[PDB]
Amino acid sequence: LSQDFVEALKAVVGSPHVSTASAVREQHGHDESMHRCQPPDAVVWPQNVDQVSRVASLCYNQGVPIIPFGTGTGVEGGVCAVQGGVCINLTHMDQITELNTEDFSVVVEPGVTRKALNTHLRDSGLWFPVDPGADASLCGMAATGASGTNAVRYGTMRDNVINLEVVLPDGRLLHTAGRGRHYRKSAAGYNLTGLFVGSEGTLGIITSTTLRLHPAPEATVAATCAFPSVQAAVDSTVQILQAAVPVARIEFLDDVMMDACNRHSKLNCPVAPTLFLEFHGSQQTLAEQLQRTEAITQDNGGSHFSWAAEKRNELWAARHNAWYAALALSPGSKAYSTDVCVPISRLPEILVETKEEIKASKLTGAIVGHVGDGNFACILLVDPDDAEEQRRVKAFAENLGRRALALGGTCTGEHGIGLGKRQLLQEEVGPVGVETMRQLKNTLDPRGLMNPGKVL
Ligand SMILES: Cc1cc2nc3c(=O)[nH]c(=O)nc-3n(C[C@H](O)[C@H](O)[C@H](O)COP(=O)(O)OP(=O)(O)OC[C@H]3O[C@@H](n4cnc5c(N)ncnc54)[C@H](O)[C@@H]3O)c2cc1C
Numbered sequence: 001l002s003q004d005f006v007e008a009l010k011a012v013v014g015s016p017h018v019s020t021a022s023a024v025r026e027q028h029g030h031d032e033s034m035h036r037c038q039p040p041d042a043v044v045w046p047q048n049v050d051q052v053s054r055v056a057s058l059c060y061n062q063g064v065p066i067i068p069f070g071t072g073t074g075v076e077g078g079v080c081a082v083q084g085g086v087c088i089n090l091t092h093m094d095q096i097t098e099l100n101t102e103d104f105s106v107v108v109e110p111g112v113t114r115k116a117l118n119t120h121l122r123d124s125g126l127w128f129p130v131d132p133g134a135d136a137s138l139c140g141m142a143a144t145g146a147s148g149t150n151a152v153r154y155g156t157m158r159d160n161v162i163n164l165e166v167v168l169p170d171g172r173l174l175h176t177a178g179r180g181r182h183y184r185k186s187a188a189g190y191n192l193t194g195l196f197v198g199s200e201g202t203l204g205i206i207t208s209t210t211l212r213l214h215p216a217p218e219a220t221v222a223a224t225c226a227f228p229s230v231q232a233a234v235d236s237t238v239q240i241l242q243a244a245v246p247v248a249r250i251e252f253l254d255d256v257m258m259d260a261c262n263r264h265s266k267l268n269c270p271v272a273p274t275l276f277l278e279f280h281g282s283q284q285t286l287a288e289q290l291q292r293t294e295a296i297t298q299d300n301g302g303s304h305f306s307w308a309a310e311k312r313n314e315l316w317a318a319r320h321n322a323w324y325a326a327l328a329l330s331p332g333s334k335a336y337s338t339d340v341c342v343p344i345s346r347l348p349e350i351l352v353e354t355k356e357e358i359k360a361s362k363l364t365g366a367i368v369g370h371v372g373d374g375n376f377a378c379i380l381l382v383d384p385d386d387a388e389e390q391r392r393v394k395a396f397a398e399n400l401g402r403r404a405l406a407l408g409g410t411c412t413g414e415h416g417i418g419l420g421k422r423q424l425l426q427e428e429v430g431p432v433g434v435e436t437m438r439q440l441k442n443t444l445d446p447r448g449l450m451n452p453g454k455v456l
């Protein structure tokens with residue numbers, strides 16, 4: 001990367017905000033995935049949207065790949081600079097604006113996390129529900145199409161993104177639903193906002209997100225329920241959903257996951273396949289829901305509920321940190337995570353099969369999941385220096401993904417494709433789907449410089 005180009009970058013953002021130092025590039029060449037670190041040639045921190053546009057235009061017209069970088073908590077190698085280029089760390093634009101409590105909406109820049117937004121919303125009666133366990137950039141969450149434990153009731157990012165501000169690959173500024181617009185529904189034109197949700201930085205740079213806010217629940221109760229088997233827990237989950245209990249959270253942990261979370265949180269739940277549950281409503285609705293849900297879990301062999309302000313906070317903090325709890329089983333390890341999502345009536349088949357295959361395999365794994373969505377993750381620990389283990393893990397993940405596809409499902413419910421699921425995506429949507437996705441990529445990024453090598 002030439003001196004002249006680096007100085008042009010410095011003219012846009014300032015010398016402190018451009019670095020070609022190896023350590024800085026290495027820190028921005030990987031995420032939380034096991035994908036190999038691939039450092040960008042430079043890291044750049046733009047300070048406002050005009051600077052993002054100018055950096056994009058400089059890179060694009062000079063043939064230099066662009067890698068958008070939020071908080072680096074992705075798990076599919078989205079930020080790995082597989083073709084080098086300029087990593088654009090967006091987190092210095094960290095402002096909340098256009099808070100409209102009367103409309104239930106807010107605009108956030110990439111440096112705002114869910115924790116920051118909800119802290120700024122303390123005492124407002126509103127909150128933002130989509131809750132990855134990581135302290136992630138909200139614009140990064142829009143880019144990956146994230147969900148979370150609350151999505152079963154309150155929706156995913158796709159359900160809660162109203163508008164996006166996007167710097168297109170050549171630097172043009174696009175407000176996907178129109179500048180300053182926010183509303184509950186529209187039929188106006190083609191829905192551009194949905195195209196950029198889940199685009200993972202391959203179609204443009206999200207420089208602000210307009211988010212739907214939600215009313216705080218009148219009352220909340222959390223609980224845990226232990227089961228004798230995976231299939232008892234998952235049958236209970238499906239029956240709760242088919243009974244239309246409007247649970248706020250319903251999360252599955254197998255016995256391995258539950259042991260791991262116990263060791264990492266000083267929770268002390270029975271080591272068994274477990275559901276973590278949360279209910280929102282008034283006192284009358286909560287009593288109604290709790291007794292319907294207890295009846296269903298009891299029918300399938302669930303233990304009595306173990307009840308959970310500080311204790312529900314510890315419960316969900318343990319769940320949110322499940323990734324790190326699993327990693328702490330074998331220290332020094334990395335991990336790959338699967339993320340399939342299937343029609344809910346097929347969830348018992350595939351979760352039980354996954355448990356049986358983990359146990360039959362020489363591999364170690366923990367199972368945890370947003371099962372209210374028909375979604376779950378297998379966390380598969382890896383020795384970073386064991387190439388034989390690595391391709392056995394990758395074969396296990398690919399076979400699980402193909403089983404989900406055979407059941408009518410998708411290879412990823414929330415994490416995205418990045419580097420790891422590109423072949424599974426081709427199988428999932430077939431040749432006309434792939435070509436159509438490619439056509440969209442090419443019209444927005446003709447030179448192919450917008451995070452190359454990802455998704456497609
Ligand atoms: C402990 C833990 C728990 C997690 N739990 C969940 C969970 O429950 N649900 C879930 O969905 N994910 C979860 N994740 C994954 C991760 O937190 C999400 O995918 C999150 O949305 C990533 O945001 P980020 O800014 O950190 O992404 P990064 O790793 O910085 O980037 C991810 C991808 O999006 C692109 N990108 C980032 N910011 C932008 C932007 N502003 N504009 C355009 N492209 C951009 C990058 O180029 C890359 O391709 C978890 C991760 C961890 C470590």
Ligand SMILES: CC[C@H](C)[C@@H](O)C(=O)O
Nearest residue numbers: 075133320322323337377
């Ligand atoms: C980073 C993978 C894990 C499984 C995350 O998705 C979660 O649900 O806590």
